Subunit: 308 residues, 3 copies
């Protein structure tokens, strides 16, 4: 027995999001559906296993859960649980809309309850410190709201989706200023640097949610978001040797949320006949990168260097 | 004789804004007009009294005014004077557009002069400190501009209204990041905690001004603003026991600006047939809360625990 | 021989931008074209001279260039080189679209490479300090992207222009919060205060780029940007005696980017029949101010107080 590290939910997250990106190519290239189904089944299977492992953690390692919950830094990773639950719901919708809808509401209510309890509590002061200003905060504060937005849109609740979308978008703009100033002043320590991959996520996760609500209309807002997203991509590419100064590691799955959302949004740009060449590049690049993450993870597993 | 504490202008502010919310229901439910008129008359009467009291302060307690003006924290409350003057103008417009227009211009010129003189002066450095980063700064920097926007729209100056609207909206987005980071790191002391109610205001005051200019069109921007507004509401509800740790007090009128603007915007959502159930909830909730503020204020008055 | 101070590129920048503002009045008042051509030729001639001077710096004073590049503050001024190169391209487009397009791509690729190499590197921490939080950072992070946006639109690449536009707009919103908080807390030293003129630039440079892409449609976003732009103008006017506490100096060319972009955007507002009176005022004001900068620069030159 061992306690599952919460960040491992980023693996089914990235795979699930990538499944959904391929799903959105099925009417352009029908073979995309099989790719989407295989990614979706793998993501769902991994999610089930990790949910079971985390249920075991809650039962037998509760003080570890309590400590991560109350941490002004580590609490954020818990949001991966409802995020992934909603993404698995989106996948399952293609086969069973009833079960999908249950998962989507559990993850939406769960993430909103979680932020309401913990993100707000930080405003009491004295626990969060300047050094707590980490990319992981995007998970409960931003990514969870975007994922509710797009999942609720899938279910037909577009106006409710816009409320979640706005909560995420404005929360993003209100957090990022202080994050980037912190990174400029304070060198993030190597053990946390893989989480720089979360910095890729906001603009791409935002535009993918936006396009899912707005019926895939590639408008001025969508193009604006893509532009900042690519700026951040270029910055993180330049930063990559520094990010991995102390070696490649499984934490690099942090990049997969933004990469998969870049792929998803590319499908909508392509469908809309906007920047189709960029779209192709983006879709291929993100798939190659996630493919590399998969190969490195299989390798770690075959060495027995995966679970703590 | 006594010097009137400037924050007491939040009382006619909240009542005036709530009058205007009811006004906007009159064609759906005609009895709303009487409710609006009674709220409006009470707000206007209280405003007249407080303006007279503040004129007395200026004449006989000028050094107290000077000290609050030059304070990098306390100066903000002075913006309540022009804000309330414009809101009373909006109320009076239903009876006398000439007098209303005079009040609206006095409050617009007054607030813009005030910010131009004081908000900019802070950028000289060395007076404002990290500890000066309080919710009250929203008053001169954000709320005053939104109130000019909607008042100018009432008078038919929609494009000028958009200039004020943009000044407020961008000023909001540019201040809030550093406010929330400050609250996370530094516990706000109990004596200032009621001012956390001002954190409710931006998104709701923003959307209410937006809808007043844009002829009540409930569009993507409006829905985005409502979503972040509700996020902040939920956070402040969770925080409420901490806010009132040292007891209930008259400072809780700080919440009334955001509550009344939530009510006002709800009327527009309802008229637009967007999220009508949410709209009803919001309108009823804000009225109940402001009603409780009124009952607690009457009680303080009947104990002689109102004026210093 | 002497090493050219990099900030002097602000002179051809301001003149070039002002040339383009006049260009956009030619169909309303045909004599505007001659004014535009004279400004454009002067700006281009000064640019050629300064590029040659900087090429000499690179050849014979390389360690000075290296030190400014690696400085977390001084690196920003280098972005003036590609910015001005693109603006000269926009001017030359009226006579030779082929040469113009070459300059526009050199400046676009150059600025994007520059930011990708240096702006991102700051996120490694430990070099940039709180005291490095200067208005000049807008140059690589914001202004360069807006200038690419509008230049690419000139060439017909509107959707690519929107990507650059979004990169600039979101980068602006994400930097300004921490800049203004820094200015409030820390008094900027006199020797840097002229750079407060760069604070005028974002909203005006943003709206001018937006209007250049969107085919001159003066919409809600444009009006919002103008409103915040004018707020900042009023604040900087109030601050001007403090800015020039230690005397008038050539650094005041910092204001010319925002002033010229206010003029440019005014032409579009005027064409769109939005706030035409404000438009006239803005256009005349910015021209008078830049005219004063020119007269003061001629005077410095005639005293031999221009080049180091
Ligand atoms: C994803 C699930 C995370 C849940 C973490 C909940 C942490 C609650 O935390 C604990 O709850 C205890 C009661 O059991 C209280 O006695 C403790 O004071 C409190 O710290
Ligand atoms: C992801 C699903 C939501 C997790 C809900 C766990 C409920 C947390 O519970 C509460 O959080 C508070 C801290 O904010 C503590 O004061 C309480 O002791 C704790 O029980
Ligand atoms: C954080 C940055 C927010 C940018 C918001 C851009 C506003 C969207 O821009 C609007 O989009 C519409 C559809 O494309 C256009 O028709 C409008 O004219 C345009 O202003
Ligand atoms: C998100 C982008 C993924 C879409 C992959 C598109 C690859 C198809 O390639 C495109 O096929 C078209 C016909 O179908 C041709 O007209 C184009 O020239 C070709 O580039
Ligand atoms: C709402 C009204 C607030 C006005 C406060 C103005 C504060 C001006 O302040 C004082 O003005 C004096 C002249 O009377 C000067 O001698 C002082 O230096 C200056 O501090
Ligand atoms: C709400 C109506 C606007 C109030 C106008 C009061 C004018 C303030 O006046 C000035 O403010 C400056 C500080 O910025 C001081 O330098 C001056 O001494 C003071 O007179
Ligand atoms: C701080 C966040 C700003 C969000 C801006 C949202 C841009 C408004 O969004 C625009 O609104 C129009 C009317 O609903 C739509 O038709 C446009 O397509 C949509 O982008
Ligand atoms: C801002 C929201 C305030 C509006 C209050 C609406 C309360 C009216 O209630 C509504 O009345 C309708 C007919 O008028 C019915 O069709 C609806 O079922 C009912 O909910
Ligand atoms: C506008 C042009 C600015 C270019 C500045 C480049 C600064 C590069 O800097 C230097 O490059 C040297 C190689 O020449 C290396 O040996 C040094 O380590 C590096 O500091
Ligand atoms: C304005 C045109 C772009 C200038 C390109 C100069 C290339 C800078 O070059 C590199 O920058 C790095 C710092 O980020 C250093 O590590 C390298 O030593 C240096 O060569
Ligand atoms: C940082 C602030 C961003 C503000 C974004 C405003 C969104 C643009 O606003 C949109 O513009 C369209 C064209 O005018 C309108 O038709 C839309 O209804 C309006 O929401
Ligand atoms: C950017 C603003 C620059 C445009 C300068 C406009 C000055 C023209 O002036 C305008 O001329 C019109 C006829 O042409 C008249 O109808 C108007 O009354 C007059 O104000």
């Amino acid at each position: 027995p061992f306690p599952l590290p919460t960040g491992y939910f980023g693996i089914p997250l990235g795979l699930a999001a990538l499944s959904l990106a391929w799903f959105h190519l099925e009417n352009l290239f029908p073979a995309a559906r099989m790719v989407s189904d295989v990614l979706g089944i793998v993501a769902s299977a991994v999610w089930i296993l990790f949910i079971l492992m985390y249920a075991y953690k809650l039962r037998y390692y509760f003080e570890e859960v309590r400590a991560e919950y109350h941490s002004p830094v580590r609490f954020s990773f818990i949001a991966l649980i409802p995020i992934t639950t909603m993404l698995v719901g989106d996948i399952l919708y293609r086969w069973n809309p009833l079960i999908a809808e249950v998962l989507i509401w559990i993850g939406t209510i769960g993430q909103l309850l979680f932020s309401t309890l913990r993100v707000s509590e930080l405003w009491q002061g004295g626990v969060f410190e300047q050094k707590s200003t980490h990319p992981s905060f995007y998970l409960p504060a931003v990514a969870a709201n975007f994922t509710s937005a797009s999942s609720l849109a899938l279910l037909g609740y577009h106006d409710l989706g816009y409320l979640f979308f706005g909560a995420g978008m404005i929360a993003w703009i209100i957090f990022e200023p202080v994050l980037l100033q912190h990174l400029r002043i304070s060198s993030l320590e190597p053990q946390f640097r893989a989480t720089m991959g979360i910095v890729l996520a906001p603009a791409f996760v935002c535009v993918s949610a936006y396009l899912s609500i707005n019926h895939g209309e590639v408008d001025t807002l969508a193009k604006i978001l893509w532009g900042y997203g690519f700026l951040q991509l270029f910055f993180l590419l330049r930063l990559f040797p520094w990010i991995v100064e102390k070696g490649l590691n499984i934490g690099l799955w942090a990049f997969s949320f933004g990469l998969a959302s870049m792929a998803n949004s590319a499908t909508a740009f392509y469908h809309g006949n906007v920047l189709q060449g960029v779209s192709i590049f983006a879709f291929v690049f993100s798939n190659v990168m996630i493919g590399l993450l998969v190969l490195m993870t299989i390798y770690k597993l075959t060495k027995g260097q995966f679970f703590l």
